[PDB]
Structure formats: C-alpha cells, structure tokens
C-alpha cells in the first residue's frame, strides 16, 4: 500500500473513443479518459470481489448489458501510435501572432502527450487484460445466452487487431473466443500468423510472443494455412534438437495441431508431409546413444523422447512412417546391455529404463500388430529373436516366492505374452504352462501374493497413499492370464 | 508487570536470527519500546499504570544519558583545549545542560509623574525600592525568570537571552551577552574564521566574580538572582529548583564543580589575577562522588527508583559496582527484590553492555542476573523466554535445569533456540529426548524434526537419507522407522527427480535377505525329510524357489544413477555389500544340493552344483570380477568339484 486503484462505485459505462471522438492522445479528452481508466480500475477491483463470491455463493452472479459487466463496446490497442516528434522542426521558428500561438499550443500539448501515454498504457493494461479474466469466470459458471454477448464483443476486437499486421497484448480476442467454443473464432483473425510470422523458424530470440499466441490460435472448428505453417513448425521446429536435451513445448504444440479444424482423419497427408523430409527420424538416435550433437548420453533424454514416440504412435499412419526407417534399428543401436538385454528389467537399479521399456517399446510394436498386421511380419519375428532371453526368463523367473517384482514388470509381461499371441496369428504362414502354474499358486496364496509384490518406484508408493495398488494388480493378472497359453 | 515489555526487549537481543550486529541499535530499539509502553499505559489504564509509565520515562531518559591552537590565545582557546584534553569534565558539562508571551516593551513614563524618577535605567530600582517604575514588569522579573530556570537545564543561555529580551529588560539582558568569552580575529586563530569581529568579554573573570556578587545580593529577591548564581556556577538558591528531585540537585552541583576548576585551570593559563575579581576566587577543587553522597542522603525518594540510581552511576562512570549491587543484594542477601524493574532492566543491560565493553559487565554478574530473570520468568508463567535467556547460560550453572525446561517441544522459532541450548550445553543422550512423550545417536533421531521448516529445507531430505544409511550399516530398522516418518515431503526441484532410487535401494536389500533366510527352512524341510506320500511335490519345489531369488536379473546391487542424488558412496556402498554377501550365498547355495535329502528336484544325480560356473560368469550381478583373476577364481574351479563329490 498505497494501492493503484481508487475512485468510485460502478454505474458508469464509457471510456470509449466514440463518445470522446477520435481526437486523441494529446488533450483534455484523453485526460478524462486516463482518469476514467482509474475509474475502471476500481470497478474491476470490485469485480475481483465478484469472483471471490463466485467461489462462495451469490444471488445471480451473471448480469450483462453483481453489476453489469458489459461496459466496453470497444477496446483500444491504439497505443501499443501517434508520432510526437517531427512536428518540432516547424516549432523551430514559430511564434509571431495568434495563428502561431495555436500551433505552439498543439506541440506543447504533445509535450503533455509524452507524460500521458505512459500513464495511459499502464492503465489500459490494468483494465483490458483483467476484463478478459472476468469474461472467462462467467464462462466456467453455468452457461446463459448472455455469454453470447461474448461473441458480440470479441468480434469487434479482432477487427481492431488490424490497424497493423503490438502482438504481446494481442490475446484479448483469441483466448476469450476459446472459452466460448470450449464451453460450446474468425477465420480472418487466425490467418494473421501466416501473414506476420514468416521470416524464419533459429531467430527464436524474439519469437516467444508468436509461440504464446499461436497456441491458442490453433482452436478452430482442413485449414490450407495449416499445411503451410506446419512445413516450418515441428518439421524444422524439432530439427533444432539435433542442432542443440529434448524440450517440452514442441510435442505440446503438436497436440494443438492434432485438435485443429479437422485433422483427425487427415492423418495420411500429415504422415506424408513428415515422411518426405528426412527429419523426425534423426531424434530416434538420441535414446540409442546421444552424441550426434555431442550431448552426453544420460537416460533423462529417453524420458522425453518416450512421450515424443508415444504421441506419434497413437496416429496409425504417423506410427507406420517410422517402423521401416527403423525401430528395429534403434533397439540394435542400444546404449546398455545390462538393462535391455537381461531377462527382466528390474526397477532396482535405474527405474528410468524400467518405465521406458514398459510404457513404450512394447505397446508401440503391439499397436503395429493391431491393424491385423500384414506388413510388419519379418521385423516382428526378428524382434522375438532379439529378446529371446527375455521371453524365456519372464515365463521361468517366478516361483511361488519371488520378491523384487513390481506392478510395472507385470505390465511388461502382459505386453510380452500379448505380443507372442498376435505374432503367431497374424503371420499365419512354449513353456507358458509354467507361469500359469506360478500365478494360480500366488492366487490361492493371498499372503504370498500381497507380500512378494511390493512398491519400488515413486509412483507405486502413492498407489498405497485406498490401496489402488492391489486393484491394479488384480486387473493386471486378469488380462495377463487371459492372453497366456 | 507489562509482559509486553519483556517481549519488546527480548526480540531486540535476538525473530531470533543470526546476523552481524553493532549493539548500539539494541539501545535504540530499547528506547523505542520504552517510549511506546510509556504512552500506552499513560492515557489508558489506572493511575498506578501512570507511575509504571513514569518509570519507563526514566528508562528512556537514562538510555539518552549514556551518550550525552597552542602559541598565544585569549581565554577562548584555553576553554576549548580544556574540554579537548579531558573527557570526564566534557561529559559532566553535557549532563547538566541535558534535561511564548507577548510583551510590548517600554517604561519610564509613569515613574516621573507620581514622584521621582530622575534617571532612566533599571538601576534606579537598585538605588532604592523596586516599586519605582511600572509594577506589571515587576511581575515579569519573577515570572519570565521562572521560564528561564526551566530553559538553562534544557541547555543554552542564548535561548534565555531571547526570553530575557521579552521580559521588558534591555540592559539587564547585556548580562547574558556577558557570559561569552572573548572570541576574536585578534587573539584566536581557529575562532578567527567563524567570526570576523569581536565577541564576548576579555575581562570574563572580573565579569564572573561581579555576577557572583548578585547571587548573594540581598536587594535582589530569589526570582532574579538564581540564574546569576548559575552564571558563575550554581549555589543552590532554591529557584534553580523547579523539579526538586535527585537530578535537579545534581545539575546545579556539577555546575559549581566545573566553575571553580576552570578558574584554577585559568590560573595556569593566567586569566585570573588580582584585577580579575571584586570577590576572592574559590580555588578549591570539588569531588563528584562525595556530592553524590550529599544527593543520595537528601533524596531517599529517588532511591526507590533504581533507574535514577543507574543514571547516577554512568556520571560516576562506575558500571561494574552498580551491576554487582543489583545481583547477589551486596553479599548473599535479598534487597534487590523491592524494586520490580531492578532485576528486569539491569538484566537487559548486563547482556547488551557486555558486548559493548566486556570489562564493564563483570560477566559473572550477567550470569547471576539472567538466572534471577529466568526464575522470575518461571513464576511469570512464561516458558517461551526461558530458552532465550539460557543461551547466555553456561554449562556450570543450570545444566539439568535447562534440560527439563527444553523437554517440551513447541513452536518453530522456539525450536531454533531449543537447539541452541540443547547442543550448546552438550546434552545429546540424556533425558531431554524421552521426556517428549512423557511430559550418541539419540539426538539424530530427534534432530531430523528441525529441518522441515524453510532455509534448511534445501538441506533437509539430503541429510535425512544420509543418516538412514549411516545407522542402517550399524543396524537399526526400528530407528529407520523414525527417519521415514521424520522424512521431508519434498525432494523434487522446488524443494531445492532427485531422490527416489533410494526407494528401490531398500527393496533390493530384501531380495538379498530372503536368499539368506531360505537356507534355514532348507535344513528343516528338505534335509531331514526323505519319505513320500506326495512329499516330492512339496520339498523338491522349495529348493527351486531359493535358486530363483539371489540375483536380480537386470543388475543387482549397483546404483550411480540420476534418480539418485550426487555422491559416490551410493555406488561404493552397494559394491561393498555385494562383495561381502555375494560369495556368502554361493557357499549357502552349494550345500543346498549336496547335503540335502533330495540332491536336485531328482533325489539322486547331480549336474547343477557344476553349473555354478555359469552363474559366476553371468552379468546379472557380474560375479566374474567379484572373484579375482587368480587365487580366488582358480580355486573356485576346485570348489564346485569339491561339492560335486560332497553329494557322495
């Protein structure tokens, strides 16, 4: 304290450039306006009180047109404007009479504007980007056809994006739209990225507003803009990881590309456009042994590349674009032979490689056999040969006492037995009986059951912090023993 | 009372945090507290709280009262050098000095008309009656002089000049320009530059003995002269008293101590002669402490204020002597107990002064005083300042006393003081740490409680898991229960994957133990039973189970990972365990097939105490470098041959 609000109860609805006609950013009209944005300051502090009672409880929160919350029929993004200098070489000899005296007052008025715009800008910033906040809380509260007055207002603010095309306050017309068709815009507005952005990809040393923006721009309800923009982003976007530790927000923006104006069934032209370019198939090598860029191979790298190949392998064309260009490859290019070639990948010692080989690297190859696979046939025989030792251990390993096992490993053998089953069916051109015996044995023995299988990873301890852990283990052995011969 | 007073003086001493300090601030914080207590009960409360607030006004005053050329000269540079080259006189001068009317002027009209007047001056008053002029300025010679007596112990005389001038006096105000010594660009050389003209009297000593004749003038009533006493050093004429108390005596006292002795000093520097008086000069030097015994016997009404006694002792400059009389008091007696601010306020200053001057506080008198304060805190019913004042305590007095105070566990900031009397007084395995529920590595169990709060939350979970593996080798899983419920929650990045390999380090230790365990139930259930009724399918399976649990298929007993926090004693320790226990189980596993009733899961016949060779060759536990190249590994080809013939 002192606080930056101050002046007077809500019941006034203006601070337009309409009422005070466009004659502005130099004169008394503007001065009424900047102290009006002190007004709106205290009005929206008052409306922060309406969000704290949106939480608690209040009579008829929604009220449009409590207090009415529509009160800006234009928002101004006009000071980012008006040149102040280069009316001042005229100034350098003027003064002789009263038409000069009019002149000289207009330029002294701009030495007034030099203060007033700084004020203005701080104050419309407090005003507008919080109006949006209010709008969004009204949306997450129960829908009304007065949140379609939201449609009425957002439209007037993407046409007042244009007057230029700065961009770090342009979001008061995007993300507001996003709440509407999320709870339930403008083709024109969303073209603006393909206009402005294009000068690069490197020289992402000032591209951070564009990325912020772009995110919420991908929301539309195929875009021709989409194929074009895409040749640069997450084709050549992700190249820079071979020109660098892999990074979150690449794969996240991919997810937004997935959800945009229909791409759901266009999976074919996405996979193609990706396949033509040699990238998105260089990054595979990082998990094999990272040193392509001389970044030393730490198993942290795998943790992110996992999520990457996961978000790929969902979409069946984008999955298939990878198997040929070599997955059986990546396995053979392996870094360690004490942690992918031993019979059971154990949580003890490095649960990094343990999370990885369970989640990916089995479920990816399975999906490739979920198409009633007809293509993958030699590659998959070769891959039972490769891990021949692991197939015979995962059956054998279990006695009726066998500590040092986790629910994770159970999942891995679900995976493994499921794979051998499909392999045999889907070519169409055995000591499992052991593990059936072992599992019955632990079923009839609840004490050895509960005791031997124990938590090891951090995840698992939270599986006991309701004991959803056992729940997992039951649904596990169901499916495991179902698929097992 | 005012337990708010206690908090307000114990926080300053130390939010008890450790930082560099200059302990002048702790006097200023003490004065700031003192003023505000002294207000908050001096306008609300009863009237005994106005005497409580009067005492605290004294306390303020006292903390105010700790603080406060050569070749040929006039008398001005003598006086400067005097004050320069001693500092007990200079302080004495500062003590006595430290603690509105509208008058149209003019006279001499009304006087000639009734009777005589005959010459204008206020020296007509002095040839005879003081009724001869206007008698409503006869008023002013009492009254505005009374204002002047408050002023001179509020400091200055040029202040008093400005009020003398409103008193309708304009030639009796020349006497207050008289008090100036000669300051001149003719006879001083460093006072020739803040003045460029003559100032004062260079017959200042004949001025002093002539303004001293008025201090005794018996035509002068006391309401004029008492300032004329004071202008030549103050005889106590009873109207230099207006406060009449211990300190009002002492000001006027001390004024005369300096005023005798400056003339003496000026007889060395020769500004005293025989043309420099009308009255013979008092060239007796006067003593401070003896005139304090006058003051002390005079006012046993200010012997009841111990703060007024603290005030005295800094002008004596005898701080250990007062501090030793206010703890036991004198010698083994109670007499310090009859002021209720004595044992508090002299406690606070004993701490804080010991850091200023450490000869000034005896340091034994600190020790005795904080103990006296702590017993009175015991009787207060406070128990969250008994820690704060037993930091300063020592292991000689109050060892077990503080043990048993600090037995109760409480608020986070108080646990920081707890630690700093626990491990300060060196008690780590006594009877603090079991009187937490009822009421040497014991205190490490209890020392992982202190780390949860901030500023040691980045070091928290690091030390926790260290201390787990320190007394996991020694052994104590009962106590390992108490680093895992005294476990810091956070260990992610915002505490600082970090530390979540240790979760699995406990689990691969159980894979090792079951292997050791299953050799017991072998000698029981296998090797003393050799009968059939479907018993093959119960004892021949037991032998197989123990073979499936002694190696982790991936890698056993190795860690060095990034889900492990940094240290190479997380790699080594797993290695040292591996080499001591891995050949122990190979010796166990060898008798499970050669001395058993059923030698395999076939009662006769052996092949599988000759396939130990492959099981040391495997990299599932990499037992091919856990037997050294020669002398171990060579002799091991002897060992499985030895036991292959132990089946016989």
Swiss-Prot record, chain A:
It is found in: Nucleus, Nuclear pore complex; Nucleus membrane. Component of the nuclear pore complex (NPC). NPC constitutes the exclusive means of nucleocytoplasmic transport. NPCs allow the passive diffusion of ions and small molecules and the active, nuclear transport receptor-mediated bidirectional transport of macromolecules such as proteins, RNAs, ribonucleoparticles (RNPs), and ribosomal subunits across the nuclear envelope. Due to its 8-fold rotational symmetry, all subunits are present with 8 copies or multiples thereof. Interacts with POM152 and NIC96. Functions as a component of the nuclear pore complex (NPC). NPC components, collectively referred to as nucleoporins (NUPs), can play the role of both NPC structural components and of docking or interaction partners for transiently associated nuclear transport factors. NUP188 probably plays an important role in NPC assembly and organization. Present with 11700 molecules/cell in log phase SD medium. Belongs to the Nup188 family. This is Nucleoporin NUP188. It comes from Saccharomyces cerevisiae (strain ATCC 204508 / S288c) (Baker's yeast).
Swiss-Prot record, chain B:
It comes from the Eukaryota. It is found in: Nucleus, Nuclear pore complex; Nucleus membrane. The keyword Protein transport applies. Pfam families: Nup84_Nup100 (PF04121). GO terms for cellular component: chromosome, telomeric region; nuclear envelope; nuclear membrane; nuclear pore; nuclear pore outer ring. Present with 8580 molecules/cell in log phase SD medium. PANTHER family: NUCLEAR PORE COMPLEX PROTEIN NUP107 (PTHR13003:SF2), NUP107-RELATED (PTHR13003). Belongs to the Nup84/Nup107 nucleoporin family. This is Nucleoporin NUP84. It comes from Saccharomyces cerevisiae (strain ATCC 204508 / S288c). The gene is NUP84.
């Amino acid at each position: 304290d002192p606080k930056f609000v101050n002046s007077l109860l809500a019941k006034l609805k203006d601070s337009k450039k309409l009422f005070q006609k466009k004659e502005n950013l130099t004169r008394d009209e503007t001065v009424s306006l900047i102290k009006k944005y002190k007004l709106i300051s205290r009005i929206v502090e008052i409306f922060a009180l309406c969000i704290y009672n949106s939480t608690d409880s209040n009579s008829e929160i929604l009220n449009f047109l409590n207090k009415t919350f529509h009160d800006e029929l234009n928002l101004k993004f006009k000071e980012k404007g008006y040149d102040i200098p280069l009316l001042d070489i005229v100034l350098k000899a003027d003064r002789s009479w009263n038409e000069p005296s009019k002149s000289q007052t207009n330029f002294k008025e701009e030495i007034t504007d030099a203060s007033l715009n700084l004020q203005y800008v701080n104050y419309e910033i407090s005003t507008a980007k919080a109006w949006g906040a209010l709008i969004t809380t009204f949306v997450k509260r129960s829908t009304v056809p007065l949140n379609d007055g939201f449609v009425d207002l957002v439209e007037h603010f993407l046409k007042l994006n244009i007057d230029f095309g700065f961009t770090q306050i342009y979001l008061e017309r995007i993300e507001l739209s996003f709440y509407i068709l999320y709870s339930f815009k403008i083709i024109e507005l969303m073209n603006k990225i393909f206009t402005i952005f294009k000068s690069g990809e490197l020289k992402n040393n000032f591209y951070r507003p564009l990325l912020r923006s772009v995110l919420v721009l991908l929301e539309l309800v195929i875009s021709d803009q989409l194929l074009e923009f895409f040749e640069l982003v997450f084709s050549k976007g992700v190249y820079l990881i071979l020109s660098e530790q892999d990074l979150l927000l690449l794969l996240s923006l991919f997810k937004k590309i997935t959800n945009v104006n229909p791409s759901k069934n266009f999976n074919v032209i996405l996979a193609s456009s990706l396949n033509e370019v040699g990238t998105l198939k260089v990054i595979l090598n990082l998990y094999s042994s990272a040193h392509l860029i001389r970044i030393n191979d730490e198993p942290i790298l795998g943790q992110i590349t996992l999520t990457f190949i996961s978000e790929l392998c969902s979409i069946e064309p984008i999955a298939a674009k990878l198997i040929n260009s070599g997955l059986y490859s990546v396995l053979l290019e392996s870094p360690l032979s004490v942690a992918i070639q031993q019979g059971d990948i154990k949580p003890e010692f490095s649960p990094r490689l343990h999370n990885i080989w369970s989640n990916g690297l089995l479920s990816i190859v399975l999906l490739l056999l979920s198409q009633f696979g007809i293509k993958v046939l030699p590659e998959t025989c070769l891959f039972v040969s490769y891990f021949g030792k692991q197939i015979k251990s995962t059956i054998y390993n279990w006695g009726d006492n066998k500590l040092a096992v986790s629910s994770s490993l159970i999942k891995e053998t679900n995976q493994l037995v499921l794979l051998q089953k499909m392999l045999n069916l889907l070519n169409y051109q055995h000591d499992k009986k052991r593990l059936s015996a072992a599992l019955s044995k632990f079923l009839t023995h609840p004490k050895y059951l509960n005791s031997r299988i124990i938590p090891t990873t951090l995840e698992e301890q939270q599986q006991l912090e309701r004991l959803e852990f056992v729940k997992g283990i039951s649904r596990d052995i169901k499916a495991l023993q179902d698929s097992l011969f | 009372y005012q337990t708010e007073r206690f908090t307000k003086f114990s926080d300053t001493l130390k939010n008890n945090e450790q930082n560099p300090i200059d302990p002048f601030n702790i006097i200023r914080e003490f004065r700031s507290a003192a003023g505000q207590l002294a207000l908050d009960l001096a306008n609300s409360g009863d009237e005994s709280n106005v005497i409580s607030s009067k005492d605290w006004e004294l306390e303020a005053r006292f903390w105010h009262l700790v603080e406060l050329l050569h070749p040929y000269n006039s008398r001005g540079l003598f006086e400067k050098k005097l004050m320069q080259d001693n500092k007990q006189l200079y302080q004495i001068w500062i003590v006595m000095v430290w603690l509105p009317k509208n008058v149209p002027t003019s006279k001499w009209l009304n006087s000639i008309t009734s009777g005589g007047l005959k010459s204008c001056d206020l020296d007509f008053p002095l040839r005879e009656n003081t009724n001869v002029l206007d008698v409503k300025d006869k008023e002013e010679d009492h009254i505005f002089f009374k204002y002047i007596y408050e002023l001179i112990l509020a400091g200055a005389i040029d202040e008093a000049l400005e009020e003398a001038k409103l008193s309708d006096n304009i030639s009796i105000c020349m006497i207050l320009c008289g008090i100036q010594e000669y300051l001149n660009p003719v006879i001083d050389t460093q006072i020739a530059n803040e003045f460029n003209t003559q100032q004062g009297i260079k017959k200042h000593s004949l001025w002093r003995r002539t303004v001293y004749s008025l201090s005794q003038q018996a035509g002068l009533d006391p309401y004029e002269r008492a300032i004329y006493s004071y202008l030549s050093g103050a005889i106590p004429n009873q109207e230099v008293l207006q406060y009449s108390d211990w300190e009002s005596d002492l000001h006027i006292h001390l004024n005369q101590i300096l005023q005798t002795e400056i003339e003496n000093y000026l007889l060395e520097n020769n500004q005293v002669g025989t043309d420099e008086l009308i009255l013979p000069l008092p060239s007796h030097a006067l003593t401070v402490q003896e005139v304090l015994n006058r003051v002390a016997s005079r006012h046993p009404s200010e012997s009841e204020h111990p703060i007024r006694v603290l005030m005295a002792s800094v002008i004596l400059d005898s701080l250990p002597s007062v501090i030793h009389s206010s703890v036991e008091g004198t010698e083994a007696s109670n007499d310090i107990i009859d002021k209720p601010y004595l044992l508090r306020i002299v406690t606070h200053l004993a701490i804080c002064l010991d850091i200023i001057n450490p000869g000034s506080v005896e340091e034994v008198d600190k020790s005795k005083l904080i103990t006296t304060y702590i017993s009175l805190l015991k009787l207060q019913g406070l128990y969250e300042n008994i820690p704060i004042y037993a930091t300063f305590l020592n292991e000689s007095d109050c060892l077990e006393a503080c043990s048993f105070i600090l037995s109760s566990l409480e608020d986070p900031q108080v646990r920081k003081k707890q630690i700093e009397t626990i491990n300060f007084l060196r008690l780590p395995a006594s009877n603090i740490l079991r009187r937490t529920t009822q009421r040497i590595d014991m205190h490490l169990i209890y020392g992982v409680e202190w780390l949860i709060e901030g500023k040691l939350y980045v070091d928290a979970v690091h030390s926790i898991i260290a201390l787990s593996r320190r007394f996991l080798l020694n052994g104590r899983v009962k106590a390992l229960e108490q680093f895992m419920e005294r476990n810091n929650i956070g260990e992610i990045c915002k505490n600082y994957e970090n530390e979540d390999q240790f979760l699995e380090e406990i689990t691969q230790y159980e894979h090792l133990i079951k292997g050791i365990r299953e050799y017991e139930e072998w000698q029981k259930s296998v090797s003393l039973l050799s009968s059939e009724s479907n018993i093959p399918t119960l004892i021949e399976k037991l032998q197989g189970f123990s073979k499936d649990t002694f190696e982790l298929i991936k890698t056993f007993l190795v860690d060095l990972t990034s889900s492990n926090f940094a240290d190479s004693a997380d790699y080594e320790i797993l290695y040292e365990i591996r080499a001591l226990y891995t050949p122990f189980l190979l010796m166990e596993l060898h008798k499970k097939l050669v001395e058993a009733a059923k030698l395999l899961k076939i009662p006769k016949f052996i092949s599988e105490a000759l396939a130990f060779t492959s099981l040391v060759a495997n990299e599932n536990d990499k037992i091919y470098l856990l037997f050294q190249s020669s002398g171990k590994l060579k002799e091991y080809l002897d060992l499985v041959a030895r036991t292959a013939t132990l089946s016989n």
